[PDB]
Amino acid sequence: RARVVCYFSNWAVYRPGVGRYGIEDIPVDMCTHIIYSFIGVTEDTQQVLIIDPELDVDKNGFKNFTSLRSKHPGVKFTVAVGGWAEGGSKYSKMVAAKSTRMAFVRSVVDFLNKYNFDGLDLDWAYPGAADRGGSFSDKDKFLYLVQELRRAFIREGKGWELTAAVPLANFRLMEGYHVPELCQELDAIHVMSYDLRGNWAGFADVHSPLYKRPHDQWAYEKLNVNDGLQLWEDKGCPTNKLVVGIPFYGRSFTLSSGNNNYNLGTYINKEAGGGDPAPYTNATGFWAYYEICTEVDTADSKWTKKWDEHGKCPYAYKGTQWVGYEDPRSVEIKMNWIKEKGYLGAMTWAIDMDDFQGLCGEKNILIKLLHKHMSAYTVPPPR
Ligand SMILES: CC(=O)N[C@@H]1[C@@H](O)[C@H](O[C@@H]2O[C@H](CO)[C@@H](O)[C@H](O)[C@H]2NC(C)=O)[C@@H](CO)O[C@H]1O
Ligand SMILES: *[C@@H]1O[C@H](CO)[C@@H](O)[C@H](O)[C@H]1NC(C)=O
Ligand SMILES: *[C@@H]1O[C@H](CO)[C@@H](O)[C@H](O)[C@H]1NC(C)=O
């Protein structure tokens, strides 16, 4: 009854060489819930925005994805609306009035019917966030959107699920999330327990520490997976609605000039924007798990690998490059911790960044860990 929630990135198909990851690459049997990311919302009409129509519609992306249920009928296939790149202003605008929300709700219902999805994952980052085009009113109005979507899903009579991806920082919760009301309307809360540290913070650190470290101060004090999930509980979310996010990627940094200190919290060249891009994801500031393991785990690697004893995460560095991530050791620790706490399951961002090619050894090694622990686990009643 535990969940293994797999976010699937529709843009991963454009990665060159062995990075190429399409619908056919999804290890469907390792997941209980798979989420096609992303669709968006239009600025002008508050309707569903199809972001890559040539892929999603013309090449039958949406339907290829949902058709996987023929061979795997136990698995739920949903779609996610939003994501970071979509921005927050169009969503704040969409929820501002009852009329615009109902327009979106209708559009959503038509879309889900048309492409045979099992429901919707909400990925607005974030209601109430001034840095994301949000405002104070978003908190009530996001709740209204959620209530209105749930009611529409009920009226359709197909048992569609409604879920949401959420942050764990307290200030974000206060600004955007009516926790008890949201958790009762949603089938699951996909907690984004990653990107907790990164170039934007001005220092090198792992981005999904499980527990507090000594250098964690002020806003960062409780910004860890354990305390963050505890925060969701304290604000009124039942343990059996909480799904814990696991990143299949690392956050990278370029260290400051002449800096020979590689410890957690060391100063960085923030203007660099992060570590140098890797060959497949091609982005400053992060590496896919498979880009990390092919560099760090080879026999003749010049990388130095270390372990965060409190956060329970690996980090590795070479020259000016520093990357914090998750490996099988750290993932295993989180799986056991999930079961100990009694949470609903594990989520990954994102399945397309696992070592699906087995470049480093075993294919799909990280998702195999999630599946192994969750499939043998019974979620206890709410605490
Ligand atoms: C709701 C939310 O904040 N979703 C986050 C993701 O958007 C984000 O992944 C990022 O998605 C972008 C598209 O919206 C991509 O442009 C970007 O490359 C991608 N970044 C990574 C590292 O995959 C992830 C991770 O930052 O957090 C999600 O929960
Ligand atoms: C969908 O499946 C068809 C038939 O195998 C394939 O030709 C097409 O490329 C697939 N589309 C996507 C987006 O994966
Ligand atoms: C890779 O990303 C960089 C950003 O630094 C961009 O300039 C370049 O066009 C990208 N290359 C490919 C082949 O995607």
Residue numbers in the entry: 24 to 406
Task: Reproduce text from the manuscript describing this model.
To investigate the substrate-binding mode, three proteins, OfChtI-CAD and its E148Q and E148A mutants (referred to in the following as E148Q and E148A, respectively), were crystallized by either co-crystallization or soaking with substrates. Co-crystallization of E148A with (GlcNAc)6 was also a failure. The structure is similar to that of wild-type OfChtI-CAD, with an r.m.s. deviation of 0.16 Å based on the superimposition of 383 corresponding Cα atoms. The O1 and O6 atoms form hydrogen bonds to the side chains of Tyr217 and Asp218/Tyr272/Arg274, respectively. The side chains of Trp34, Phe61 and Trp372 are involved in hydrophobic interactions with the sugar ring at the −2 subsite.
The glycosyl hydrolase family 18 (GH18) chitinases (EC 3.2.1.14) are enzymes that hydrolyze chitin, a β-1,4-linked N-­acetylglucosamine (GlcNAc) linear polymer, into chito­oligosaccharides. Among the eight groups of insect chitinases, group I chitinases have been enzymatically well characterized and have been shown to function in a chitin-degradation process that is closely associated with insect moulting. OfChtI is highly active in the hydrolysis of chitooligosaccharides, colloidal chitin and α-chitin, and exhibits kinetic properties that differ from those of bacterial and plant chitinases.
